[PDB]
Amino acid sequence: TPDREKALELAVAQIEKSYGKGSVMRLGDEARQPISVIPTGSIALDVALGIGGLPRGRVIEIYGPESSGKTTVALHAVANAQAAGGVAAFIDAEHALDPDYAKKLGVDTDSLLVSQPDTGEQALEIADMLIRSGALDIVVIDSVAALVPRAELEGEMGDSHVGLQARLMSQALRKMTGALNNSGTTAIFINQLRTTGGKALKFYASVRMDVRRVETLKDGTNAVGNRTRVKVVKNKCSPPFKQAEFDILYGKGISREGSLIDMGVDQGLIRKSGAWFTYEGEQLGQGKENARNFLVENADVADEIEKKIKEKLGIG
Template identity: 45%
Template sequence: MMSEYEYDQPSDDGKVLEKDAALRLALSRLASEFSRESMLSLQRFFGSRHAPIISTGSLKLDLALGTGGLPKGRVVEIYGWEASGKTTLALHIIKEAQKRGGYCAYVDVENALDPSLAESIGVNTEDLLISHLESAESSLSVVDTLIKSGAIDVIVVDSVLRPVLQCSLGHGAAWETEMMSEYEYDQPSDDGKVLEKDAALRLALSRLASEFSRESMLSLQRFFGSRHAPIISTGSLKLDLALGTGGLPKGRVVEIYGWEASGKTTLALHIIKEAQKRGGYCAYVDVENALDPSLAESIGVNTEDLLISHLESAESSLSVVDTLIKSGAIDVIVVDSVAALVPQSELDSVIDGTRPKGQSRLMTQALRKIHSSLCQSQTLLIFINQVRSRPCEGFGNANEVTCGGNALKFYAAVRMRTMKTGLLRNEDEITGVSVSVQIVKNKLAPAMKKAELEIIFGKGITSEAEVLEMACTHGVISKMGDGYYIEGEVLKDEEEAEKYLAENHEVLEKVVSILRSQLFERT
């Protein structure tokens, strides 16, 4: 029938009428072949089908997109290197959707979303649905159920890196379903439409409740009031302040990396010390076989209560890490170091000068599994890593690259780079080093802050000097000229005041406690 008239010459009125008749016939056939609901979808499609838009929160980005924002009913991928603003951008999109009365969901596969950070951006966390499920299948099932409910305006999946399944979901994804087409969600002023959305949302949550356990269901409720990650201090008030949260978050992966003799192991031991002070159990996976118990004890670590592992292969070491995390009994695990994690296949091979290829693959596989265990525990997992001089692509210093591939960069909630900046001397004797710690990545607070620390050989980070400085700044200790007034004691100069704090541990702890209560509301 269609071959009797040419569609590419619409100037002939007769041919146009024939085309109209042919189209009506085609629609009639579709109506008999499919349901009326499908037919209505076709009619709506042939009318006006402009996708509703949600702003990104940035006028420049909305302008670059050309449509004023991101289209609903579509899949959007946000990708990039670590600490490049992916999560922040996704949270701004959620904020914009909530401003228009929309419901949003955050599938936190990385278990790294911090409520205080989301709230500081402007997200209403009380009305944000959060999912923390272990497997990719469960997470994607939640996404599918929420989409089919037609009640959700924006769903963010953070991130694709961790789930085992390969899928086309990116950091941000929004769908407009058949149910949504019956009423526009970007016009929340209509009370009837809002009520319909509420009913659809309740139905979706009810379906999820039957699919998953009650515990998983509670994670999907609007529960964000008490979702703050517990914090462990680094042992340095300056560094805790630079981190913005008062320390490092439990249930997360942290990477400490830098050149040799830049204080990486010392910092890790101070974190273990702080965890032990709070009654926590800690483990040290000494892959390098270089941990000296006397050094750890001089810093203040209780080595008798410290679990220490010396295993040969990377597989064995990472299996120990996974088992300890799953036990739920360990507060801090330190892996020292990533560079020394050698796959069994490489140990069994002959040294022939070829470049090993298995470590990056092994780290990716191990982190996927370990991260899943971390989501169910409150363990702080610290990887100590080394750097190498080599040109590399991507965000960061182009002249250095960390060992073990890129997976750790993405899985880490916090990345700290240590760098030796000078030597400490007492007359002609070198007594320690000054170290700069930069927060390269931070998923809980603003990144790129620095803390300048002093490390004394055989003692560790000197806390007295920084505590004295910060206590004077915040009015905890009174300074009168060159003298200091501490707990009724008058001390003539800075050196004497630092010595007093070092010799009176209870006074030092009291001052630190007051400072932490002033500086960090959560700790």
């Protein structure tokens, strides 16, 4: 009990020294809060991440099946990065971006940098060049799987295809990783399930986020969107394995308002009087949709609830 606590503290400090802060953690530890972070769009996810959003100057992975919300989550990071006066870049190998959708989430698409690269390496080379500017806050790569190597695209079969894309990622990441730390830019790599250089990205990433749809939500017989679930399977900035749920509405994106209520009830700041959402003596709405909508029209209290949740947990 007494002599052990000493050897353990020391052991942990040596580790923390030799390999960097967050190399070891107790899953009950509180997070050390950084100066700035990139909010994700959902307070529930931001809480689950510990530091109130995505880390800066780090590699991030967001993965899941097609149309899980990964991209939606990624674009929300992009919007918030811009909202705070940052500059954003989107390296696109899928050609699937919907800017009108992006726009409604909050993205300043007019001022969003976009490259549609010829090759996997060009994709990463370009990313690198922007990262080394120091003028970017966030860069998103859509996606890991589409980063096909020149040789494969040029028709050569000499390597066979065995490991050339994975080797490409590995190299690029090493080179890229130091660049991000100096610049303070965040690299989001989007990745699918069933990818190619994920073996490399898995270890360089400071945060890996497993995203998927849970249930379809609706008014009656018409699909408004999806309850989305994210597990932070890897986190080097705060205790990992935390998960959060939030709502994505088609054509609207993540319901900030929905996450505010869900976390409100969870934290006891919001009370239920049987389907009746209370806040500090005043009523928000009957059922979740009226609570959600009340907070839209009344963005005053929605900011107070958000502030109130953060303060109560030590976030932001």
